[PDB]
Write a protein that binds this DNA or RNA. Structure first.
Lengths: 170, 170, 170, 169
DNA sequence: ATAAATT
DNA sequence: TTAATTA
């Protein structure tokens, strides 16, 4: 039904780790959530599940990862994210970078170049800009930075209570 | 003053154990010779050295490897060779495959393709066919293939006196 | 929509403190300018962007910095600058020394000539005089010195005001 | 009377820990030698001193530095070394690499670019080839190859006893 | 007194 | 369903 938590993730690299450390912990504070695993590849956009999700979902939490440049499906997802955000700024974005530098989002260099260069031999000549623009417009909004060294856990604590706050009082 | 034996090489992966032996070993026979040498990179078609010696040659003996596709340069050198050979079939080739089998290296598959596709999308959208139809003609003429074990000494000898026969006595 | 204010500066030496800071302050004051960041290396100095702007340009503002010598394209940039200054002196130049001393740059002394000691056996042994004539020409026009103490605050504020006043009340 | 084992060295960059140490130890065997420090600088051709010693001595021992090529004065000296060598192979060589490996000397390549690269800017395109051709030929004969950690003192001994043997026998 | 391709 | 630097 109506819930306020839509997510995202990399594929094999971190989806399982995040489900183990954040998703449950969230469920322990009484908030219905959402996500899934399937890869389709029989087309590009699943209808009233992907779309019911983005539509009714409220405050997004896109855990960008150090591989978040390979999945065309993931690239088109965060897109519609930033799109249906820019309509009525009462729903808010909460980015949480991971391992990969927050210096590599305001211009896409470093670990992404081999990804895009081969990704650019394939798809459109235009829409790729409406993706690049969105991946631009996160590296400014606020951001828990969790490096590879700081305690990769109880930051879960610090990060849940907040998502509670923006709901309890309003 | 004019030599009688051309050559060709990849670069930083057989400028040591094999080739150099063959050069010195050959000089040890009074068969005045030539080879590739300069770390030049200069030009995309240099004339008054190669393009003098090539049509000054008499016997061709390239030495493929497992990365012989990377060449933006030696590749067309091989091309120039196989072409000009077609003019006067009074001079022959005698290539000796190296480490990689003479199968996956006659149809641009195996660990050889991904280098060619990197050097296929790069330039003249027609010339790639010219390079492939150049590499193809080689992998038929007989040749003392070398593997991991065949002692790198004996093969040198057996390639010597042979190279001699088609020069001294015909 | 035409571009009215030009710049030129060594790259990795004020890509992270001033040049940006200045451009941002400017665009928050209503003035359509242009700079860029493409290293080219596909010729000498192209047309459809730099030659477009410079000829259609107006108010010149370049910025010397302690790397302002190895500018194989950018020194040329200054050349074109000073020669497209040679037609109607109704467009001026307000260069601002930065960190580098004000008068040591009139003869390339101090820590400057060591660029030249090797920068004479590479490019043309004659046009160097037409480069040095220009790099001499700046050391004269009245404006703002900046050391390491005059903090990069106010300088922004004033260096805006002049540029605007040469547009509003003429 | 006359010198017996003529030396050479880098300029200042190794006038402490090694060279000297070697010189004293050598002299403690009773084998008359040479070494001088005079800087000339009154030109470039020094005559009746080493130019008498080079055609007067016997068995050599040129050492290389981390930057021997940069020194024009020592370079030209090793030149005449190899040249008064070439006329007869009765007198030997006996090099000793040091602060550089024979991985970058049979090539004048590697850290030598800083040297030759602007050592030539003034000098002709022929003499450079002559010198370089001389520096090449040391890269062959035998090498103690004193390295970064090997104790230098243990090699002074193992480099004296030899020169001794090549004098008694 | 200390940069180089697209080897 | 993988990749070069003379700002």
């Amino acid at each position: 039904v109506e819930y306020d938590v839509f997510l995202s993730f990399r594929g094999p690299d971190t989806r399982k780790q995040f489900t183990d450390f954040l998703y449950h912990f969230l469920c322990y504070y009484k908030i219905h959530t959402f996500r899934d695993d399937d890869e389709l590849r029989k087309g590009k956009e699943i209808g009233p599940n992907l779309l019911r999700a983005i539509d009714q979902s409220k405050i997004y939490v896109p855990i960008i990862s150090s591989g978040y440049a390979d999945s065309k499906w993931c690239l088109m997802e965060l897109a519609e994210i930033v799109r249906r955000q820019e309509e009525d700024p009462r729903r808010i974005i909460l980015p949480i970078f991971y391992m990969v530098d927050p210096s590599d989002v305001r211009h896409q260099t470093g670990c992404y170049k081999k990804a895009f260069r081969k990704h650019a031999n394939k798809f459109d000549g235009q829409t790729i800009q409406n993706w690049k623009d969105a991946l631009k417009k996160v590296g400014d909004l606020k951001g828990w930075h969790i490096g590879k060294d700081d305690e990769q856990g109880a930051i879960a604590d610090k990060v849940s209570a907040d998502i509670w706050s923006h709901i309890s009082k309003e």
